[PDB]
Amino acid sequence: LGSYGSRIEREQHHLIESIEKSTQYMAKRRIGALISVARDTGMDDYIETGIPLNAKISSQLLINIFIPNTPLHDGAVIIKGNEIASAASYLPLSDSPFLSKELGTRHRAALGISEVTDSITIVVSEETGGISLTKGGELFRDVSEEELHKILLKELVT
Template sequence: MEGLQAWLTNQNWTESLTFLLDVGLVLALTYMVLLVIAERRTLWMVRGFIFLMLAAAASNRLGLTLLSFVLSNLVIGSAVAMAVILQSEARRFLEQLGRGDILNMLRPTRQGVQGPKTVLDEIVDAVKELSQNRTGALLILETQDIPIDERDFSVPGIRLSAEISRELIQTIFQTSTLLHDGAILIRGARIVAAGVILPISERTASRQLGTRHRAAMGITERVENCICVVVSEETGSISLAEQGTLNRPLTSSKLKELLEARVNPSVDEVVTPSLRGIRRQLREKSLALLPRLPFPGSRKKT
């Protein structure tokens, strides 16, 4: 108790209030930036940048000169890179800030990506129509959160990072497009790449199986955390490859049932936290760290 009284007596409240105001303004600015950002990967990048800034400030405060110099330059380089990568987000943020829409920026928004059932419906509907039109197709679906190593592909293909839709899948596999001769890689609720060339299985397969079926068997033999959906160009039959084995022929309803049982249901959904929830979390963490918080001017004067 005496130690707490001595700390309160020697505390420089002006510097402490300035410190709290500084931290509060930084948190408010960070919150506004996160509201503008829409994608989960971009959020991770911003969080990494914030971590670098905090590490640079901490190293400077602790007197670690060399580490502070390296981190400060790394922060500058990261800021320049992010300004190039996040051009649209930065432009939208500056436009809202210039119009004075600060209150609107602080309002919580919710941007939901397609849920897992909607994603599977889009995939199954696209496969069904491709099958009816006898258009060959090959789709790779990751079944776990661990991404497939691109080195397992013969050719990684062209990166797309597009939301899954029935129309997009059908368009990719039209013979008049440049990306039809290959597979599309689906991760969560997005098409990551198209025109992916897969290794061919070395197993002795039936003569009725074409290159797409053998490619589906080859990648599922090599990679455990994926399955492949194949649409035959000759017969229009639907097949599902898993661990090097083909399950065929399938109806669209049976395909959906198998996908629901095997595909990881976790799909990225961007939900901007409400200001009330952030305030409650900050209050709880602040109360937990308050006895150990090194406020400026807390050292005893000698």
């Protein structure tokens, strides 16, 4: 609880900064990433699919998880509460015919989880390095640093 109105407000700003730094690092290096931040819905069903970490949130841990050809890189990192709950979780795929065919199953899975939960999911493309975000069944494609920070600030701080 430093310089913020609560411990919780501080932890949420730490979560935002960890997501920003990690995606920035992984985007430059064309590293695929899938980070889904649970909110009100509760995502215990999909945490059980992956490998449980229950680890403190940091930009460095988020990077090491998605390094290619490593035991944790294929799947989704799910953040629940104030910790990284699991890695290598699989998400439901959206059946939307409106998803661009330029986007692979990683983008299609992030859309799938946004349709059935009120979570925020962040995607970094292996092909292009573009950062994308899904919420409420809607995808924002190739967002900027400024645009991403505005969405995370709006949707992840309470």
